Amino acid sequence: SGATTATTTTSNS
């Protein structure tokens, strides 16, 4: 758990 750190790239393939 915890706080979510943003700026991910969404995985496709």
- Site residues, another protein (CB under 8 A): 1-13
2, amino acid identity: G
The pair of structure tokens assigned to 5 is 């750190």
3, amino acid identity: A
Q: Work out how close the CB of 1 gets to another protein at its nearest, in angstroms, rounded to a whole number.
A: 7
Q: Work out how close the CB of 4 gets to another protein at its nearest, in angstroms, rounded to a whole number.
A: 6
The pair of structure tokens assigned to 3 is 């706080």
